[PDB]
Amino acid sequence: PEMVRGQVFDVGPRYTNLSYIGEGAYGMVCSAYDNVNKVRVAIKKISPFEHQTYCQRTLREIKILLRFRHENIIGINDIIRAPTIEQMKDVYIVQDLMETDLYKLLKTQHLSNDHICYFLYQILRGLKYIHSANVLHRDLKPSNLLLNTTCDLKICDFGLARVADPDHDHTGFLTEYVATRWYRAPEIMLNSKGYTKSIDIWSVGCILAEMLSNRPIFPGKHYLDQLNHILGILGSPSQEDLNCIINLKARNYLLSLPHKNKVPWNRLFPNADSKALDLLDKMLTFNPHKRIEVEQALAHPYLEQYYDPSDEPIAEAPFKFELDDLPKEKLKELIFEETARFQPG
Ligand SMILES: O=C(CN1Cc2ccc(-c3nc(NC4CCOCC4)ncc3Cl)cc2C1=O)N[C@H](CO)c1ccccc1
């Protein structure tokens, strides 16, 4: 078999001429020539069966992405694994190959207002579909937005995604959380388990802000520093928004802080389109109940040149699947079952 940077890449006969793309905790990714469709593809090798939480992510990723079909959501084209559970140590997930991601693009490229508008439109168009399936992405960030050579955008990495559960969203103050720090909504640190659609809109707000300046808007250096940054720009919460936080630890923390005034968006972003800043403000609302929803965001005047609800599809039914209690050994079985459709047969 072909190897790349040490690892065996058992992807043939269909996929040949591998080039290394990158690596992480997930595994390793290469481009490969697909000998059926005659295009290069992305292939990521995942080796998760020795820890339950890698199994969870892999299964969430697989189940969600096979059910979803949308232009602004990365699909799964093919999955390669051994023919038996016993022999299955790796899963190879085949996906459309994208030129870059919004993280890499933001470190080197100034975005025109027309690019920001188009990228924001596509994020929200994909997110409309996600939310319509009652799913929360929960880790939206520049590196999870893939881009092709014509700036078409696809949301990727559904391994932290959850079915929405707003009746069980409440928790205590400083309750530990998994998703990416700079894009975490203020309520995560105060009283939310991150089980409502509003968590994703916050992350989109952060991404909008970052597109306007090429710098993260709330670059907290650790867990409660993240609220420090947030409140440094939004200013102190209003009496009404505070009264919505019934948890006493969280409310009294907020009351203990000196009063801070709102930094106006147009001084933080002096060159930004004023409509973009109005939408930003509505996505970066402190109170999650008052935060704009995806369909409202799409209908915002900033996006008028693209808004077309008949061309912003929704999912055919809500998604349902839970996984926290299931062992490593059951999750292997489910990944095996979920990938069977791709086997010769
Ligand atoms: O799978 C992932 C996360 N990842 C990693 C990755 C790498 C590359 C591409 C990708 N990249 C490109 N092009 C690139 C060209 C170079 O510039 C950048 C873009 N084109 C297409 C794709 Cl799909 C996509 C992904 C993705 O979704 N994590 C699973 C589930 O959470 C997981 C499972 C178990 C434990 C931990 C995590």
Coordinates of N, CA and C in Angstrom, one line a residue, residues 148-301:
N148 N -13.4 26.7 -1.8 CA -12.8 26.3 -3.1 C -12.2 27.5 -3.9
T149 N -11.7 27.3 -5.1 CA -11.0 28.3 -5.8 C -11.9 29.5 -6.3
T150 N -13.2 29.3 -6.3 CA -14.2 30.3 -6.6 C -14.9 30.8 -5.4
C151 N -14.3 30.6 -4.2 CA -14.9 31.1 -2.9 C -16.3 30.5 -2.5
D152 N -16.6 29.3 -3.1 CA -17.8 28.5 -2.6 C -17.3 28.0 -1.2
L153 N -18.3 28.0 -0.2 CA -17.9 27.7 1.2 C -18.7 26.5 1.6
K154 N -18.0 25.6 2.4 CA -18.7 24.4 3.0 C -18.3 24.3 4.4
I155 N -19.3 24.1 5.3 CA -19.1 23.9 6.7 C -18.7 22.5 6.9
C156 N -17.6 22.3 7.7 CA -17.1 20.9 8.0 C -17.0 20.7 9.5
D157 N -16.7 19.4 9.8 CA -16.5 18.9 11.2 C -17.7 18.9 12.0
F158 N -18.5 17.9 12.0 CA -19.7 17.7 12.7 C -19.6 16.8 13.9
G159 N -18.3 16.6 14.3 CA -18.1 15.6 15.4 C -18.4 16.1 16.8
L160 N -18.7 17.4 16.9 CA -19.2 17.9 18.2 C -20.7 18.3 18.1
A161 N -21.3 17.9 17.0 CA -22.7 18.4 16.9 C -23.6 17.6 17.7
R162 N -24.8 18.3 18.1 CA -25.8 17.7 19.0 C -27.2 18.0 18.4
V163 N -28.1 17.2 18.8 CA -29.5 17.5 18.6 C -29.9 18.6 19.6
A164 N -30.6 19.6 19.1 CA -30.9 20.7 20.0 C -31.8 20.3 21.2
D165 N -31.7 20.9 22.4 CA -32.4 20.4 23.5 C -32.6 21.6 24.5
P166 N -33.3 22.6 24.0 CA -33.4 23.8 24.8 C -34.1 23.7 26.2
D167 N -34.9 22.7 26.5 CA -35.5 22.5 27.8 C -34.5 22.0 28.9
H168 N -33.3 21.4 28.4 CA -32.3 21.0 29.3 C -31.0 21.8 29.1
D169 N -31.1 23.1 28.7 CA -29.9 23.9 28.5 C -29.3 24.5 29.8
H170 N -30.0 24.6 30.9 CA -29.5 25.3 32.0 C -28.5 24.5 32.8
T171 N -27.5 25.2 33.3 CA -26.5 24.6 34.2 C -25.9 25.6 35.1
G172 N -25.0 25.3 35.9 CA -24.3 26.2 36.8 C -23.2 27.0 36.2
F173 N -22.6 27.8 37.0 CA -21.6 28.8 36.6 C -20.2 28.1 36.5
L174 N -19.5 28.5 35.4 CA -18.1 27.9 35.1 C -18.1 26.4 34.9
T175 N -19.1 25.9 34.3 CA -19.3 24.4 34.0 C -18.6 24.2 32.7
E176 N -17.7 23.1 32.7 CA -16.6 22.9 31.8 C -17.2 22.6 30.4
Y177 N -16.5 23.0 29.3 CA -17.1 22.9 28.0 C -16.0 22.6 27.0
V178 N -16.3 22.0 25.9 CA -15.4 21.4 24.9 C -15.1 22.3 23.7
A179 N -16.1 23.0 23.2 CA -15.9 23.8 21.9 C -15.0 24.9 22.0
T180 N -14.6 25.6 20.8 CA -13.5 26.4 20.7 C -13.6 27.8 21.4
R181 N -12.6 28.2 22.2 CA -12.8 29.2 23.2 C -13.2 30.6 22.6
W182 N -12.5 31.0 21.6 CA -12.7 32.4 21.0 C -14.2 32.5 20.4
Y183 N -14.8 31.4 20.1 CA -16.1 31.5 19.4 C -17.3 31.0 20.4
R184 N -17.0 30.8 21.7 CA -18.0 30.5 22.7 C -18.8 31.6 23.2
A185 N -20.1 31.4 23.2 CA -21.1 32.4 23.6 C -20.9 32.7 25.1
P186 N -21.2 33.9 25.5 CA -21.0 34.3 27.0 C -21.8 33.4 27.9
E187 N -23.0 32.9 27.6 CA -23.8 32.0 28.4 C -23.2 30.7 28.7
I188 N -22.3 30.1 27.8 CA -21.5 28.9 28.1 C -20.8 29.0 29.5
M189 N -20.2 30.2 29.7 CA -19.4 30.4 31.0 C -20.4 30.7 32.2
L190 N -21.6 31.0 31.9 CA -22.6 31.5 33.0 C -23.6 30.5 33.3
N191 N -24.4 30.0 32.4 CA -25.5 29.1 32.7 C -26.1 28.2 31.6
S192 N -25.3 28.0 30.6 CA -25.8 27.2 29.4 C -24.9 26.0 29.1
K193 N -25.5 24.9 28.8 CA -24.8 23.7 28.3 C -24.6 23.7 26.8
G194 N -25.0 24.8 26.1 CA -24.8 24.9 24.7 C -25.7 24.0 23.9
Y195 N -27.0 23.8 24.3 CA -28.0 22.9 23.6 C -29.0 23.7 22.9
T196 N -28.8 25.0 22.5 CA -29.8 25.8 21.8 C -29.1 26.4 20.5
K197 N -29.8 26.7 19.5 CA -29.4 27.2 18.2 C -28.6 28.5 18.3
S198 N -29.0 29.4 19.3 CA -28.3 30.6 19.6 C -26.8 30.5 19.8
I199 N -26.3 29.3 20.2 CA -24.8 29.1 20.4 C -24.0 29.3 19.1
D200 N -24.6 28.7 18.1 CA -24.1 28.8 16.7 C -24.1 30.2 16.1
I201 N -25.2 30.9 16.3 CA -25.3 32.3 15.8 C -24.2 33.1 16.5
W202 N -23.9 32.9 17.8 CA -22.8 33.7 18.4 C -21.5 33.4 17.7
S203 N -21.2 32.2 17.4 CA -20.0 31.8 16.7 C -19.9 32.4 15.3
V204 N -21.0 32.4 14.6 CA -21.1 33.1 13.3 C -20.8 34.7 13.5
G205 N -21.3 35.3 14.5 CA -21.0 36.7 14.9 C -19.5 36.9 15.0
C206 N -18.9 36.0 15.8 CA -17.4 36.1 16.0 C -16.7 36.0 14.6
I207 N -17.2 35.1 13.7 CA -16.5 34.9 12.4 C -16.7 36.1 11.6
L208 N -17.9 36.7 11.6 CA -18.1 38.0 10.9 C -17.2 39.0 11.4
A209 N -17.1 39.2 12.7 CA -16.1 40.2 13.2 C -14.7 39.9 12.7
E210 N -14.3 38.7 12.7 CA -12.9 38.3 12.3 C -12.7 38.5 10.8
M211 N -13.7 38.4 10.0 CA -13.6 38.7 8.6 C -13.5 40.2 8.4
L212 N -14.1 41.0 9.2 CA -14.0 42.4 9.0 C -12.5 42.9 9.4
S213 N -11.7 42.3 10.2 CA -10.4 42.8 10.7 C -9.3 41.9 10.5
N214 N -9.5 40.6 10.1 CA -8.5 39.6 10.1 C -7.9 39.3 11.5
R215 N -8.6 39.6 12.6 CA -8.1 39.3 14.0 C -9.3 38.7 14.8
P216 N -9.1 37.7 15.6 CA -10.3 37.3 16.5 C -10.8 38.5 17.3
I217 N -12.1 38.6 17.4 CA -12.7 39.7 18.1 C -12.6 39.5 19.7
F218 N -12.7 38.2 20.2 CA -12.6 37.9 21.6 C -11.5 36.8 21.8
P219 N -10.2 37.2 21.7 CA -9.2 36.2 21.9 C -8.8 35.9 23.3
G220 N -9.7 35.3 24.1 CA -9.5 35.0 25.5 C -8.3 34.1 25.6
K221 N -7.4 34.3 26.6 CA -6.2 33.4 26.8 C -6.5 32.1 27.6
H222 N -7.7 32.0 28.1 CA -8.1 30.9 29.0 C -9.6 31.0 29.3
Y223 N -10.3 30.0 30.0 CA -11.7 29.9 30.2 C -12.5 31.2 30.6
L224 N -12.3 31.8 31.8 CA -13.0 33.0 32.2 C -12.5 34.3 31.6
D225 N -11.2 34.3 31.1 CA -10.8 35.4 30.3 C -11.7 35.7 29.1
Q226 N -12.3 34.6 28.6 CA -13.2 34.7 27.4 C -14.4 35.6 27.7
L227 N -15.1 35.5 28.8 CA -16.1 36.5 29.2 C -15.5 37.9 29.4
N228 N -14.3 38.1 29.9 CA -13.6 39.4 30.1 C -13.6 40.1 28.7
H229 N -13.2 39.4 27.7 CA -13.1 40.0 26.3 C -14.5 40.3 25.9
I230 N -15.4 39.5 26.1 CA -16.8 39.7 25.6 C -17.4 40.9 26.2
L231 N -17.4 41.1 27.4 CA -17.9 42.2 28.2 C -17.1 43.5 28.0
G232 N -15.8 43.3 27.7 CA -15.0 44.5 27.3 C -15.5 45.3 26.1
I233 N -16.1 44.6 25.2 CA -16.7 45.2 24.0 C -18.2 45.4 24.1
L234 N -19.0 44.4 24.6 CA -20.4 44.6 24.7 C -20.8 45.5 25.8
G235 N -20.0 45.6 26.8 CA -20.2 46.3 28.1 C -21.1 45.5 29.0
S236 N -21.4 46.1 30.2 CA -22.1 45.4 31.2 C -23.5 45.0 30.8
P237 N -23.9 43.8 31.1 CA -25.3 43.5 30.8 C -26.4 44.3 31.5
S238 N -27.5 44.6 30.8 CA -28.6 45.3 31.3 C -29.3 44.6 32.4
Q239 N -30.1 45.3 33.2 CA -30.8 44.7 34.3 C -31.7 43.6 33.8
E240 N -32.3 43.8 32.6 CA -33.2 42.8 32.0 C -32.5 41.5 31.6
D241 N -31.3 41.6 31.0 CA -30.6 40.5 30.6 C -30.0 39.8 31.9
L242 N -29.6 40.5 32.9 CA -29.2 39.9 34.2 C -30.3 39.2 34.9
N243 N -31.5 39.7 34.9 CA -32.7 39.0 35.5 C -33.0 37.7 34.8
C244 N -32.7 37.5 33.5 CA -32.8 36.2 32.9 C -31.7 35.1 33.4
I245 N -30.7 35.5 34.1 CA -29.7 34.6 34.7 C -30.2 34.4 36.1
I246 N -30.9 33.3 36.4 CA -31.4 33.1 37.8 C -30.3 32.4 38.6
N247 N -29.4 31.6 38.0 CA -28.3 31.1 38.8 C -27.6 32.1 39.6
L248 N -27.4 32.0 40.9 CA -27.0 33.1 41.7 C -25.5 33.3 41.6
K249 N -24.7 32.2 41.4 CA -23.3 32.4 41.3 C -23.0 33.2 40.0
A250 N -23.7 32.9 38.9 CA -23.5 33.6 37.7 C -23.9 35.0 37.7
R251 N -25.1 35.2 38.3 CA -25.6 36.6 38.4 C -24.7 37.5 39.4
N252 N -24.3 37.0 40.5 CA -23.4 37.7 41.4 C -22.0 37.9 40.9
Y253 N -21.5 37.0 40.1 CA -20.3 37.3 39.4 C -20.5 38.6 38.5
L254 N -21.5 38.6 37.7 CA -21.7 39.7 36.8 C -21.9 41.0 37.6
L255 N -22.7 41.0 38.7 CA -22.9 42.1 39.5 C -21.6 42.6 40.2
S256 N -20.6 41.8 40.4 CA -19.4 42.1 41.1 C -18.5 43.0 40.2
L257 N -18.7 43.0 38.9 CA -17.8 43.6 37.9 C -18.0 45.1 37.9
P258 N -17.0 45.9 37.7 CA -17.3 47.4 37.5 C -18.1 47.6 36.3
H259 N -18.9 48.7 36.2 CA -19.7 49.0 35.1 C -18.8 49.3 33.9
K260 N -19.0 48.7 32.7 CA -18.3 49.0 31.5 C -19.3 49.3 30.5
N261 N -18.9 50.4 29.7 CA -19.7 50.9 28.5 C -19.4 50.0 27.3
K262 N -20.4 49.9 26.4 CA -20.3 49.3 25.1 C -19.2 50.0 24.2
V263 N -18.3 49.3 23.6 CA -17.4 49.8 22.5 C -18.2 49.8 21.2
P264 N -18.5 50.9 20.6 CA -19.3 50.9 19.4 C -18.6 50.2 18.2
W265 N -19.4 49.4 17.5 CA -18.9 48.6 16.4 C -18.1 49.4 15.4
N266 N -18.6 50.6 15.1 CA -18.1 51.4 14.0 C -16.7 52.0 14.4
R267 N -16.3 52.0 15.7 CA -14.9 52.4 16.1 C -14.0 51.2 16.1
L268 N -14.6 50.0 16.4 CA -13.8 48.8 16.3 C -13.6 48.5 14.9
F269 N -14.5 48.8 14.0 CA -14.5 48.5 12.5 C -14.8 49.7 11.7
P270 N -13.8 50.7 11.7 CA -14.1 51.9 10.9 C -14.3 51.8 9.4
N271 N -13.9 50.7 8.8 CA -14.1 50.6 7.3 C -15.3 49.7 7.0
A272 N -16.0 49.1 8.0 CA -17.0 48.1 7.7 C -18.3 48.7 7.2
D273 N -19.0 48.0 6.3 CA -20.3 48.4 5.8 C -21.2 48.5 7.0
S274 N -22.0 49.6 7.0 CA -22.9 49.8 8.3 C -23.9 48.8 8.4
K275 N -24.4 48.2 7.3 CA -25.4 47.1 7.4 C -24.7 45.8 8.0
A276 N -23.5 45.6 7.6 CA -22.8 44.4 8.2 C -22.7 44.6 9.7
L277 N -22.5 45.9 10.2 CA -22.3 46.1 11.7 C -23.6 46.0 12.4
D278 N -24.7 46.3 11.7 CA -26.0 46.1 12.3 C -26.3 44.7 12.5
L279 N -26.0 43.8 11.5 CA -26.2 42.4 11.6 C -25.2 41.8 12.7
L280 N -24.0 42.2 12.7 CA -23.0 41.8 13.7 C -23.6 42.0 15.1
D281 N -24.2 43.2 15.3 CA -24.7 43.6 16.6 C -25.8 42.6 17.1
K282 N -26.6 42.2 16.1 CA -27.7 41.3 16.4 C -27.3 39.9 16.6
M283 N -26.2 39.5 16.1 CA -25.7 38.1 16.3 C -24.9 38.1 17.6
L284 N -24.2 39.2 17.9 CA -23.4 39.3 19.1 C -24.2 39.9 20.3
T285 N -25.4 39.5 20.4 CA -26.3 40.0 21.5 C -26.0 39.1 22.7
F286 N -25.9 39.8 23.9 CA -25.6 39.1 25.1 C -26.6 38.0 25.5
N287 N -27.9 38.4 25.4 CA -29.0 37.6 25.8 C -29.3 36.6 24.7
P288 N -29.2 35.3 24.9 CA -29.4 34.4 23.8 C -30.9 34.4 23.3
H289 N -31.9 34.7 24.1 CA -33.3 34.8 23.7 C -33.5 35.9 22.8
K290 N -32.7 37.0 22.9 CA -32.8 38.1 22.0 C -32.0 38.1 20.8
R291 N -31.0 37.1 20.7 CA -30.1 37.0 19.6 C -30.9 36.6 18.4
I292 N -30.4 37.2 17.3 CA -31.1 36.9 16.0 C -31.0 35.4 15.6
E293 N -32.0 34.8 15.0 CA -32.0 33.5 14.5 C -31.6 33.5 13.1
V294 N -31.2 32.3 12.5 CA -30.6 32.1 11.2 C -31.4 32.6 10.1
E295 N -32.7 32.3 10.1 CA -33.6 32.8 9.1 C -33.8 34.3 9.1
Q296 N -33.8 34.9 10.3 CA -33.8 36.4 10.4 C -32.5 37.0 9.9
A297 N -31.4 36.4 10.2 CA -30.1 36.8 9.7 C -30.0 36.9 8.2
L298 N -30.5 35.9 7.6 CA -30.6 35.8 6.1 C -31.4 36.8 5.5
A299 N -32.5 37.2 6.1 CA -33.4 38.3 5.7 C -32.9 39.7 6.1
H300 N -31.7 39.8 6.7 CA -31.2 41.1 7.1 C -30.8 41.9 5.9
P301 N -31.0 43.3 5.9 CA -30.6 44.1 4.7 C -29.2 43.9 4.2

